[PDB]
Amino acid sequence: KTPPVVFHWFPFIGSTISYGIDPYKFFFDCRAKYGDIFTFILLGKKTTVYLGTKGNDFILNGKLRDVCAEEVYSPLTTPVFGRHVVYDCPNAKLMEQKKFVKYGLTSDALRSYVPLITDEVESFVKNSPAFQGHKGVFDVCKTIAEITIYTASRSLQGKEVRSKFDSTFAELYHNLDMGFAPINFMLPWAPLPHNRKRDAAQRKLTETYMEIIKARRQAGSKKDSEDMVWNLMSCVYKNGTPVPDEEIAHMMIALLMAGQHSSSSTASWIVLRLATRPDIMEELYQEQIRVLGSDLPPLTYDNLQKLDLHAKVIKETLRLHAPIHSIIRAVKNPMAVDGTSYVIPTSHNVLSSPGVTARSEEHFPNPLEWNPHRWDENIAASAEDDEKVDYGYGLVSKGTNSPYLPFGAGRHRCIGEQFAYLQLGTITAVLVRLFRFRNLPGVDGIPDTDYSSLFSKPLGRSFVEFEKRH
Ligand code: HEM
Ligand SMILES: N#Cc1ccc(COc2ccc(/C=C\c3ccc(C(F)(F)[C@](O)(Cn4cnnn4)c4ccc(F)cc4F)nc3)cc2)cc1
Secondary structure (H helix, E strand, O other): OOEEEEEOOOOOOHHHHHHHHHHHHHHHHHHHOOOOOOEEEEOOOOOEOHHHHHHHHHHHHHOOOEOHHHHHHHHHHEEEEEEEEOOHHHHHHHHHHHHHOOOOOOOHHHHHHHHHHHHHHHHHHHHOOOOOOOEEEEEEHHHHHHHHHHHHHHHHHHHHHHOOOOOOOOHHHHHHHOOOHHHHHOOOOOOOOHHHHHHHHHHHHHHHHHHHHHHHHHHHOOOOOOHHHOOOHHEEEOOEEEEOOOHHHHHHHHHHHHHHHHHHHHHHHHHHHHEEEEEHHHHHHHHHHHHHHOOOOOOOOOOOOOOOOOHHHHHHHHHHHHHHOOOEEEEEEOOEEEOOOOOOOEEEEEEEOHHHHHOOOOOOOOOOOOHHHHHHHHHOOOOOOOOOOOOOOOOEEEOOOOOOOOOHHHHHHHOHHHHHHHHHHHHHHHHHHHHEEEEEOOOOOOOOOOOOOOEEEEOOOOOOEEEOOO
């Protein structure tokens, strides 16, 4: 009834298994039979799926009274991030919170991050056992996750948090990260041992962050441009109340989780693709020689934006491997589709997957082929034509006519896109300077994508060859 119900075999499990294995293949098979609208039930709820640029526009630009993001996620995210932040509050408070973070991610702050990021990556390569010797292999996902957590903590989280990852922050975030698995999506409240560790880790992280805050106020000073010393001053809401340290702590935790899971996954895919394409890596290296010079001066916020192909590699990687595959909202009021007789009721969830349009033939010819040169049409870290609407933070292009929305659109769109492009590009440029990458003998292509966790990542333990240049 209403949108076409998918023909499945069982109650309550539905196609979740088909969805969990590969959402895109599942979304594509449903599109062949049902069109740009399906409705499949993953476990308990009814999830309506609207595909196409309209489908993304319908859900991402849905009216605030009609769709609800927090209700869908809050129970999973709130125990991990903490209270009063992000989803644990009305949408208005989220917009102010987004404002504070985007406030602290200005270009001058981004400028200060580049030398820090280069320092951490160079320090890692020299001190980490992952790249010792002229030639060898290395666990891509494990190594890359360490690099993204070092670069994000040093720049964004600050000195103390960066120092804390040398002792008892590693185990804290591993314990806290156990909160995410979608099993928690439904039973985030059950007192299973993994949830008890999550709660214990969340409390301990909060106490540590606030002590770092209290220590700074005891000195009443400030150093350089981290979102910690920012949220201390960027505390006043429109009502006139300063952001309490507890909220600051929980925001940092949220930024800590969101940045790492997204950066580690994408950067891993970047390294994996470059191993399959040695010609592309050598072309990246030649770009730095041509654009920056034979001397290869240190990377800065300025000379990074000249890298055109480096940006393309990130863009093409995001197109096929963006860690989020399903955006999901809770339907509050019944909504009429603009064109058809279909009506989406309240008992339903809505799911928009901009990745489907990002791998459609009509939008990208030969979509599954990873080719950064397809982007010789246009490049944009900040992108495009459509209208810009402000919901309380900056001015965000809610535009949907685009089939390429890795960071989403509308009032929830990502505010860490610039920081992500800064971090990914910097790490990539540094790794391009230092290494060549090859697959292990006999290995062709790339590993499959794991969709079982909230975030998607490469499937198993993937190793590739590294070879230093000098
Ligand atoms: C490639 C890396 C990243 C990807 C692919 C990504 C993806 C996304 C997507 C798809 C959304 C919209 C989801 C929705 O509408 O429900 C989003 C929102 C957001 N992301 Fe990211 N993100 C990335 C990096 C980051 C980073 C580095 C941060 C913080 C430093 C961050 C913080 C956020 C925040 C705060 C939101 C707002 C969510 C909302 O308002 O509902 N993201 N992200
Ligand atoms: N068998 C089986 C089986 C397998 C798989 C499935 C289901 O498959 C999936 C896969 C992924 C999901 C995803 C989502 C998801 C998670 C977190 C968030 C977020 F909100 F939390 C986030 O946007 C994350 N983020 C973004 N940018 N940065 N961070 C965020 C926002 C603000 C913030 F400050 C920090 C944040 F990190 N948003 C969306 C859901 C289902 C079912 C069954």
